[PDB]
Amino acid sequence: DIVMTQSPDSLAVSLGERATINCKSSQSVLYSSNNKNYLTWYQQKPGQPPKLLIYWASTRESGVPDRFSGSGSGTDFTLTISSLQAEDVAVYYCQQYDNYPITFGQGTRLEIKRTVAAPSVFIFPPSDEQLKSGTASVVCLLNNFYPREAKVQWKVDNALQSGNSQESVTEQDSKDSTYSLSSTLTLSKADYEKHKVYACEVTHQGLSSPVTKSFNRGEC
Amino acid sequence: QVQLVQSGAEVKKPGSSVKVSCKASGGTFSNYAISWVRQAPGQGFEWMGGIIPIFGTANYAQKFQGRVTITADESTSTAYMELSSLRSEDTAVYYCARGPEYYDYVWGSYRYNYFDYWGQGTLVTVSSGSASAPTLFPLAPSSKSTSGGTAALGCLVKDYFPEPVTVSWNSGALTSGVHTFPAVLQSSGLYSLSSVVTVPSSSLGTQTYICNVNHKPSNTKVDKKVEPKSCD
């Protein structure tokens, strides 16, 4: 099979600037019969199927914006995205069709750069319904922040928690270039009921000092 | 405006088979080619094979030849991919994709090239574990989930298997401000995720908020009404 290697594997670019994504084939994908490179680029936005951008290395698909252009020949190809827009956050893939079977690059993830945005921080006690079952899930939400690096620590009766929380982060939102994050602390009912103060402490570049959200078990 | 609509998510035992459908709506296959492309976790997309419906001619990648059958019914503009002898490693999102063909005069044949329309994908999970439905818990809005005129609320979608779930709010009437987090796999072997939404805090007194979760692999749908906390 032909191997398609993209470079870089990810990048972060400012809005209105140029993004460059390379794709190398392990052997030529130039088809002699019409002297086209049989090379295509796809965009896969968060939550969506791939979309065709370019084929024959340099021909835009009807309706694809002007700012997408493809260049290269033989084994070395580039997708250039000029005047980057927020809606361009996606994973970009190249694919060859000169040689059976069709094969794809591994993708390049494009993030958009932006000014710092502090998270809004919210906390949710476990439902009584859940407790009755033997587990307590406590959820701390960091909404709409940037950059993606943050510190999120659970304290139970002022004791830093380790090994019992799980974090999940959304893909970057095109509408505002932010991320959100859920941190779920999981305790047994018995452990939950042995303690009273539950606190989520967040450190982030947008905050001048850490933000704590907390509640006292059993108190409204 | 052409659209490819695939069948729903599937959970299958090793050794079994799966058949995934792909229907062209507001459309017809015409003289296009329909391919099947998958993407397994940690792996790149893989072209499995395709068919040109007008000719009835299917081709497959060597890796799957002998275990995959691609067919197309022009009467219904529906294509199918049947993959047999399933293995763990077949766990993947399977896409149908339409595209044109070019004619190769040197080998005297139409050839698949690129894919201009992709279906929404079908997650097929190959596991010896059984499907199990999520349990929905409220992420109830309170003084600890408000800021100025905004309140956050949500649903904890707990302990289901395999992926995926679809989460909507108020039957799809509420989409603004929703974040549905990626699922995390728990040490129990079951998945969990939360879905949250921000809304005007003034609406907590008057507007109903229901999260709707569909979990096709266990043939379950659950709706949970999320109410504000009170000192009662």
Q: How far is it, in rounded angstroms, from Cα A86 to Cα A89? A: 6
| CATH number for region B129-232 | 2.60.40.10
Q: Any CB–CB contact under 8 A between A153 and chain B?
A: no
Q: How far is it, in rounded angstroms, from Cα A107 to Cα A111? A: 13
Together in a domain, A9 and A78: yes
Q: How far is it, in rounded angstroms, from Cα B85 to Cα B16? A: 6
Together in a domain, A88 and A122: no
Fold equal for B1-128 and B129-232 = yes
Q: How far is it, in rounded angstroms, from Cα B156 to Cα A127? A: 10
Together in a domain, A32 and A117: no
* Pairing mode, strands A10-14 and A108-113: parallel
* Pairing mode, strands B68-73 and B78-83: antiparallel
How many domains would you assign to chain A?
2
Short-list A59, A73, A63, A66, CA closest to A24:
A73
Together in a domain, A106 and A211: no
Name beta bridge partners: B1.
none
Q: Amino acid identity, residue B54? A: I
Q: Give the burial string for B153-162 (b: 16+ CB within 10 Å, else e).
A: bbbbbbbbbb
Backbone phi, then psi, for B68, in 5-degree steps? -130, 140
Q: How far is it, in rounded angstroms, from Cα B227 to Cα B143? A: 13
Q: How far is it, in rounded angstroms, from Cα B55 to Cα B111? A: 12
**Domain end call among A112, A145, A180:** A112
Residue A99 among known ligand-binding residues: no
Starting at the edge strand found earlier in the chain, the sheet holding A120-124 runs A120-124, A135-145, A179-188, A165-169
Together in a domain, A87 and A29: yes
**Residue A195 CB neighbours (<10 A):** 15
Short-list A98, A100, A96, CA closest to A42:
A96
Burial class (CB in 10 A: 0-12, 13-18, 19+), A160: exposed
Stated as kind and residue range, the H or E segment containing A211 is strand A211-216
Together in a domain, A66 and A166: no
* Pairing mode, strands A159-160 and A151-156: antiparallel
> What CATH number does the domain containing A155 carry?
2.60.40.10
Distance between terminal CA atoms of chain A?
A: 63
The C-alpha angle B80, B84, B86, rounded to 5 degrees, equals 120
Report CB contact under 8 Å: B179, A50.
Answer: no
Q: Which residues neighbour A73 within 8 Å (Cβ) at sequence distance 6 or greater?
A: A30, A37, A57
Chain A residues touching B110 at Cβ < 8 A = none
Together in a domain, A191 and A84: no
DSSP B145-171: SEETTEEEEEEEEEEEBSS--EEEEGG
Q: How far is it, in rounded angstroms, from Cα B15 to Cα B222? A: 31
Domain that holds residue A141: 113-220
**Domain end call among A90, A112, A134:** A112
Measured between CB atoms, which of B61, B104, B114 is closest to A33? B104
Report CB contact under 8 Å: B140, A124.
Answer: yes
Chain A residues touching B145 at Cβ < 8 A = 122-124, 141
| CATH number for region B1-128 | 2.60.40.10
**How far from the centroid of its chain's Cα atoms is residue B192's Cα?**
17
Calculate how close chain A gets to B118, using CA atoms only, in Å.
6
DSSP SS3 for A207: coil
Q: Any CB–CB contact under 8 A between A178 and chain B?
A: no
Q: Which residues neighbour A77 within 8 Å (Cβ) at sequence distance 6 or greater?
A: A22, A23, A24, A25, A37, A39, A57, A70, A71, A94
The C-alpha angle B204, B140, B171, rounded to 5 degrees, equals 70
Q: Give the burial string for B21-56 (b: 16+ CB within 10 Å, else e).
A: bbbbeeeebeebbbbbbbbbeeebbbbbbbbbbeee
DSSP SS3 for B55: coil
Chain B residues touching A61 at Cβ < 8 A = 116
Q: Give the max Cα distance, chain B.
A: 80
Ramachandran bin of B31, using left for φ above 0, alpha for ψ from -120 to 50, beta for the remaining angles: alpha
Together in a domain, A6 and A90: yes
Chain B residues touching A184 at Cβ < 8 A = 156, 184, 192, 194
**Residue A145 CB neighbours (<10 A):** 25
Report CB contact under 8 Å: B145, A141.
Answer: yes
Burial class (CB in 10 A: 0-12, 13-18, 19+), B96: buried
Report CB contact under 8 Å: A127, B140.
Answer: yes
- Return the C-alpha torsion angle B120, B125, B129, B132, nearest 10: 0
Calculate how close chain B gets to A168, using CA atoms only, in Å.
6
Backbone phi, then psi, for A210, in 5-degree steps? -65, 150
Residue reference for tokens 């067919």: B71
**How far from the centroid of its chain's Cα atoms is residue B72's Cα?**
21
The tokens describing B60, both together, are 């497959």
Q: How far is it, in rounded angstroms, from Cα A207 to Cα B205? A: 31
DSSP A87-133: GG-EEEEEEE-SSSS-EE---EEEEEE---BPPEEEEEPPPHHHHHT
Chain A residues touching B116 at Cβ < 8 A = 52, 61
Instruction: Name the residue ranges covered by the structural domains of chain B.
Output: 1-128, 129-232
Report CB contact under 8 Å: A49, B120.
Answer: yes
Calculate how close chain A gets to B13, using CA atoms only, in Å.
26
Report CB contact under 8 Å: A124, B179.
Answer: no
The C-alpha angle B45, B49, B54, rounded to 5 degrees, equals 135
Measured between CB atoms, which of A107, A168, A215 is closest to B184? A168
Say if CB B95 and CB B119 are below 8 A apart: yes
